[PDB]
Amino acid sequence: HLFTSESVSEGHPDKIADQISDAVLDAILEQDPKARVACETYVKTGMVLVGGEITTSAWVDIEEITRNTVREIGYVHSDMGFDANSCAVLSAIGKQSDRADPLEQGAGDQGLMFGYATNETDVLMPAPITYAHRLVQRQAEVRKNGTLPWLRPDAKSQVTFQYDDGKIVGIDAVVLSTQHSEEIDQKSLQEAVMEEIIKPILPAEWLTSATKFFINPTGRFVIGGPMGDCGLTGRKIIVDTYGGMARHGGGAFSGKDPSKVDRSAAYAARYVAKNIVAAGLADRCEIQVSYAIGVAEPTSIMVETFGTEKVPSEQLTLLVREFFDLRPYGLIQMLDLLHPIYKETAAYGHFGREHFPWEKTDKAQLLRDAAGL
Amino acid sequence: GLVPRGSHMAKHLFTSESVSEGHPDKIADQISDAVLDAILEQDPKARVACETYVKTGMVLVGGEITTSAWVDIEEITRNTVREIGYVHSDMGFDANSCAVLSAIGKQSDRADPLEQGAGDQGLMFGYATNETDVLMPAPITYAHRLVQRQAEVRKNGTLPWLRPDAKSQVTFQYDDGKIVGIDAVVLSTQHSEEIDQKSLQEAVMEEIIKPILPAEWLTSATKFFINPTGRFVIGGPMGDCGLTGRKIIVDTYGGMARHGGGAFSGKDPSKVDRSAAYAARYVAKNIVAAGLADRCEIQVSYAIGVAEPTSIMVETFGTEKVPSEQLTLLVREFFDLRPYGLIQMLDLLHPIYKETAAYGHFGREHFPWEKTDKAQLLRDAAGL
Amino acid sequence: GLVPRGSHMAKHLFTSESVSEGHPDKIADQISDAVLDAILEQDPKARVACETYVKTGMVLVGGEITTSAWVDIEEITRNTVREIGYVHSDMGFDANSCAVLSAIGKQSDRADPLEQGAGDQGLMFGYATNETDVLMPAPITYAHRLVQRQAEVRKNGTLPWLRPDAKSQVTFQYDDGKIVGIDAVVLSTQHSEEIDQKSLQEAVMEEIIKPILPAEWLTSATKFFINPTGRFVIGGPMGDCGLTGRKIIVDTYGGMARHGGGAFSGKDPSKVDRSAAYAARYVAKNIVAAGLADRCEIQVSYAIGVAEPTSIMVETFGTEKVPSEQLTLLVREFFDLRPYGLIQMLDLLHPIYKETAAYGHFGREHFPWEKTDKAQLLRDAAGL
Amino acid sequence: HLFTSESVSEGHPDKIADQISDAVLDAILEQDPKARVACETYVKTGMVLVGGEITTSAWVDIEEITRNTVREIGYVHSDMGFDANSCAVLSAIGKQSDRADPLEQGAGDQGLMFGYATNETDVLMPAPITYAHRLVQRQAEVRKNGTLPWLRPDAKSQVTFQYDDGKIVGIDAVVLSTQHSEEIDQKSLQEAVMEEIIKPILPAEWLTSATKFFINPTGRFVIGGPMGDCGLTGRKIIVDTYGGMARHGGGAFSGKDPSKVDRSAAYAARYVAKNIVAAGLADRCEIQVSYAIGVAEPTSIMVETFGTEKVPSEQLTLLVREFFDLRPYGLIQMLDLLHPIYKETAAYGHFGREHFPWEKTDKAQLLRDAAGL
Ligand SMILES: [Mg+2]
Ligand SMILES: [Mg+2]
Ligand SMILES: [Mg+2]
Ligand SMILES: [Mg+2]
Ligand SMILES: [Mg+2]
Ligand SMILES: [Mg+2]
Ligand SMILES: [Mg+2]
Ligand SMILES: [Mg+2]
């Protein structure tokens, strides 16, 4: 069969909103690690609206955080359709409306979350989303270091993999759309994108002559970013996670502090699934957890291994309960989440980069020993 | 239900949630599709991409729209919030006195129109399973029913102290694919000051939970969390932000099926984020209704400027009655999955979408993508 | 009063108007100065330029601010609208549920600080006349008194059906500079549904108009227009837009004196638009109180980066008791009209300005620029 | 004595708001001449908010009217701090909540208005405001025709005249501040401003060696327009009228249709005062009119001639009532105001330009004949 996943660059207006929300969160967590943050961003031609509910002792400058975030993305001129130095920044932030052991606090909301891991790649992530991520990240890298200076921030990527008996056979189709300045024709752009973006990223074994390459398929891409389309926080939740390979509970990540289970329980679910796969206990593993508001223990825990489990399924569920703390604040302690580390997650994927806390496999050897070594 | 730790550790549990029409995110979805419906009523070929932001006191309606239609954004917004039920400042939001701002822009060829290419790239999923009579997953179906039942009894005066904002969550137990029962039910509903929590929980169990959840699925072990944190007076936009497209798992299958990431509301039928998901449900439902599988998941993907899908996958989870390769070929030939082919196949150029913006886009039999008029054809074509 | 056409065509008439604290423009002025006061309470040297936009459902607070202070714009705004009286959706606006947005930016040397140059150019006027005990023009004074009396009787429950939005207008007749009587009175006040117009007009005349306007100035000829168009239920921001700086003639002398065009509210004392107007009133009042003229008008102008005024003019309308050239020299030496000299002369670095944002910046004796502590000095210096 | 008045260019953020409000009014009056318009504009870095109440059968595009207005002003690049092509335009426009002869309609609001005229100049306007207006208009003219291309839209002017026995003796001080690009030093700017802006405008008879000239007095003026300061409709009402020489009732002009007496009764008051002065009946003349809401006849009419009347004062008041219709809708008929003619008034003065309806002196000869010819 075939499977397809997509990603977007840091200049995509939805991702601009996600990065602004988490930039505000990082600046608040730098001063107040226990802060409650629920920050929603709306970006359109000329303006950024930053809203939500915030409870903190921190003192931050929303305008300067927003402008710096958009400067780093690359929109610094009206020719690009958006300028961090001259756009409007509006604020509509308000306020948010008991246990002896803080680890026993009930969940601040109901909801369901999923985590996933698979053998297909080295980072234990599905191949389609990983290489879709690496294509848009390579586009930004080659734009910022001056290799292809005519590139502009907004870009999208899509990769279609072919699977046979659960194994990767190759790449069926590639889509790469990138914004650019007026000073380059489409033919030169397609050659440069193939040479400096696609070929360095996609492994040659998976690229045959039957592979379809769609580079700027409709032609010129000069108007981009917030100029063309609205951007809102939390409208890229499948890009942020597994590119559709695994399920999703619906909650967005960016702009939320670690006490929101929509974010931290999904981080912990990846942490569990990755360590299970890293331990050689399964080839593929999906975890579902759910919470009731005001209840500390998860209302449900599902472990699905798609027939690839190397130990019995009842054992795997036992291992998860034995080695992981899935209570809302227990996640925070287990993963050490009260740190300004979240703007870096707001683009190119929350899962797959080994330096995040939920990407450490520091429990894999323990899980091996606890089962048949 | 008080089940201690580690007593039934082997049960397979799955959980889904839903929200009422008063949830701020759903208010944004309803406003976006109400704007869409008003435009399609005058201009069925309009391009609409309407994003709504709702907060305490204000509604921001933005996006890009290309149409000959002439609509009143303020009037459409106030009427939608009126019907939802926010008409007084005691509820935290009033449709008659709130602010309505607009930031709508103006959106920056084939011999056969059905061969037009897609307007964007993307992936979309559809799903069906014979667990319910409407071929939907059980948890999301009964999660939808609970919050719609809450709206129903609030509006007809049965429980007049209810307020629009509400959420529900149901945890089902499965044993080898068949429903065995309900393990946990969550029901949080906004209310007025004229009711205590003990009288509220009794009224919720008698007027909402019991008329909806089958008695055969409720035992001594079922946990019931009705307003688990107590008082719920401040709600709606007063409490939280609402954004179009932030309830996309509520809108589809409640987590049982995967998702491509695209929102539905505010988008005209030429956006494959919405129309191809509707088509994906249409083929998944007709495959299951034809008796060719017990549960079926479909993924389609597109490339901008390309008419044919870049990929089509059918997943049957071992429940197929014919080889899965034959199902893939049947889907490609019996359904037009081209962007403008969907529109003609599902008859989508009509103002029908505001109704979809709350309580689920799938499961209600009067929607075009819920018709099962190809099941006997698919069954004939596959042999059986 | 029914005076037919062309009966008393020779009378000299002058008209002024005022508005209550519930008028949407005045709501914007009060919010701007409430933000200013909260900042000066923590940082007296702050630069503030706060502009407010009020509409149905929302308050937009914008401008440029350079300060070490830390203030809550939302809390300051809600409290100001609370005290004005808009606390329910039946009034068209509620302080507890409206939207508050912020768009505040960050504002793009002398051995003697008093020699610092002005921050902008501009012209400003001050005025005084011995027609009233507070040395203010009669029409604007009693126009202010009428709408403040309306707020007074609304807040203490005397007439509880009143609502905050109200306007007044008084036409005086003059004969060679002395008041002869009142020719027309207009009083429009917002109200609730629980009162008819006939009972409203009687209550307005008994509880507002009669306790304020001296009986000697009311004859058979006086026209009284109380709610002349009838019902006045929708009001405040619900009906109209409100903007900082759109009541600058209400804020000063009601048209009797000229104006430079600069608004007062939202501006810290380093803005000569406000401080030099306050100083211009200070010299005009002390000249009249010293007995050196019966009415006095002062104009000062500035150039950006220049400390001394670019021009100083004293106008006495033939009522001077000493040559007008001597008055100009007295003003230049007895008053420090340099931008930061004003501040020290009037002791302006204090949170006193929210009180000025409704019912007039001039006429209330407890304001610094209303003190008359140089009158005996000016009278000594001029001879008399 | 001395007297001073100021003006601002079309690029001043308050005037940008005034021009946008009346551009919206003009586009509506083009389709619906009887429309009710109360349009308020708020401009800040990156965004335009257009609000108010409108009752019309017209169909207009607020965004395109706004962008075209700012394009004509000259803000078309982020280097200038504002760009008509990429700024945000938000709309918050709503709705507005009987006579046999429409001329007998009551006034839609109470209020007081003033008109003024004087011999000092040819256009029967006070000298300070007229030459302040002509300095900023000359700045825009020389900027747009390419004479001084380094000029930018935002500018302010101020002129201080000296009077002796009611007659002009000369100009005491001049202030001219103009925005500009980075590519010119302050010395070259001051020489070019003196040669191409000040000297062509201010008459040489009034310029002595004692005249003070303040050109960009604090130095560089690169940041300007909405980038530095907020702009709001109706915050330049003294610039719009007589520069402080005459009184003002308080009402703003721009964004209001002719049925608002704040605007049309002030236009008619200038029309009366100008024809009186044009008729040689007085050297200076100020008119005050007032209205009660729902009442058609003005509540008061004052004629002040400052001792310069050539005929008795009681006669002048009679002439005003005899030759002018000051009822709210009667103003509209007398001056033919139901036409899209108002964007041109939103900068450089509503009074002084002879092609406006209220600037015609077509009743002057009649007023002469009705009195002692
Ligand atoms: Mg999007
Ligand atoms: Mg959630
Ligand atoms: Mg939400
Ligand atoms: Mg999409
Ligand atoms: Mg007003
Ligand atoms: Mg000023
Ligand atoms: Mg200003
Ligand atoms: Mg007015």
PDB file of N, CA, C and O in Angstrom, chain D residues 148 150 184-194:
ATOM      1  N   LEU D 148      11.859  66.724  -4.750  1.00  0.00           N
ATOM      2  CA  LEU D 148      12.603  66.257  -3.582  1.00  0.00           C
ATOM      3  C   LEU D 148      12.136  64.837  -3.289  1.00  0.00           C
ATOM      4  O   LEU D 148      11.258  64.621  -2.440  1.00  0.00           O
ATOM      5  N   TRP D 150      13.490  62.354  -1.744  1.00  0.00           N
ATOM      6  CA  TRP D 150      13.826  61.817  -0.431  1.00  0.00           C
ATOM      7  C   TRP D 150      12.828  62.213   0.652  1.00  0.00           C
ATOM      8  O   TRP D 150      12.975  61.763   1.793  1.00  0.00           O
ATOM      9  N   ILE D 184      19.811  61.374   3.191  1.00  0.00           N
ATOM     10  CA  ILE D 184      20.061  62.813   3.149  1.00  0.00           C
ATOM     11  C   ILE D 184      20.423  63.296   4.546  1.00  0.00           C
ATOM     12  O   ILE D 184      19.827  62.875   5.541  1.00  0.00           O
ATOM     13  N   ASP D 185      21.418  64.177   4.612  1.00  0.00           N
ATOM     14  CA  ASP D 185      21.820  64.776   5.873  1.00  0.00           C
ATOM     15  C   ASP D 185      20.924  65.965   6.199  1.00  0.00           C
ATOM     16  O   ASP D 185      20.217  66.497   5.341  1.00  0.00           O
ATOM     17  N   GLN D 186      20.978  66.391   7.463  1.00  0.00           N
ATOM     18  CA  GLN D 186      20.062  67.426   7.931  1.00  0.00           C
ATOM     19  C   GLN D 186      20.373  68.782   7.319  1.00  0.00           C
ATOM     20  O   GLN D 186      19.457  69.583   7.099  1.00  0.00           O
ATOM     21  N   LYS D 187      21.647  69.055   7.033  1.00  0.00           N
ATOM     22  CA  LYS D 187      22.021  70.336   6.443  1.00  0.00           C
ATOM     23  C   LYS D 187      21.472  70.466   5.029  1.00  0.00           C
ATOM     24  O   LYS D 187      20.870  71.487   4.677  1.00  0.00           O
ATOM     25  N   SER D 188      21.664  69.436   4.201  1.00  0.00           N
ATOM     26  CA  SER D 188      21.098  69.464   2.858  1.00  0.00           C
ATOM     27  C   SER D 188      19.580  69.530   2.896  1.00  0.00           C
ATOM     28  O   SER D 188      18.965  70.169   2.034  1.00  0.00           O
ATOM     29  N   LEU D 189      18.960  68.885   3.887  1.00  0.00           N
ATOM     30  CA  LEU D 189      17.506  68.908   3.988  1.00  0.00           C
ATOM     31  C   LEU D 189      16.997  70.313   4.285  1.00  0.00           C
ATOM     32  O   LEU D 189      16.018  70.766   3.679  1.00  0.00           O
ATOM     33  N   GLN D 190      17.652  71.014   5.214  1.00  0.00           N
ATOM     34  CA  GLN D 190      17.205  72.350   5.598  1.00  0.00           C
ATOM     35  C   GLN D 190      17.338  73.336   4.446  1.00  0.00           C
ATOM     36  O   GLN D 190      16.479  74.206   4.266  1.00  0.00           O
ATOM     37  N   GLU D 191      18.410  73.226   3.660  1.00  0.00           N
ATOM     38  CA  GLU D 191      18.560  74.102   2.504  1.00  0.00           C
ATOM     39  C   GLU D 191      17.487  73.819   1.462  1.00  0.00           C
ATOM     40  O   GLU D 191      16.883  74.749   0.915  1.00  0.00           O
ATOM     41  N   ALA D 192      17.224  72.539   1.187  1.00  0.00           N
ATOM     42  CA  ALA D 192      16.224  72.190   0.183  1.00  0.00           C
ATOM     43  C   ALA D 192      14.821  72.576   0.638  1.00  0.00           C
ATOM     44  O   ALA D 192      13.994  73.000  -0.177  1.00  0.00           O
ATOM     45  N   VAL D 193      14.534  72.436   1.934  1.00  0.00           N
ATOM     46  CA  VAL D 193      13.227  72.829   2.450  1.00  0.00           C
ATOM     47  C   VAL D 193      13.044  74.336   2.341  1.00  0.00           C
ATOM     48  O   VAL D 193      11.968  74.821   1.970  1.00  0.00           O
ATOM     49  N   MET D 194      14.092  75.099   2.655  1.00  0.00           N
ATOM     50  CA  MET D 194      14.012  76.551   2.535  1.00  0.00           C
ATOM     51  C   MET D 194      13.833  76.979   1.083  1.00  0.00           C
ATOM     52  O   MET D 194      13.053  77.892   0.791  1.00  0.00           O
TER      53      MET D 194
END
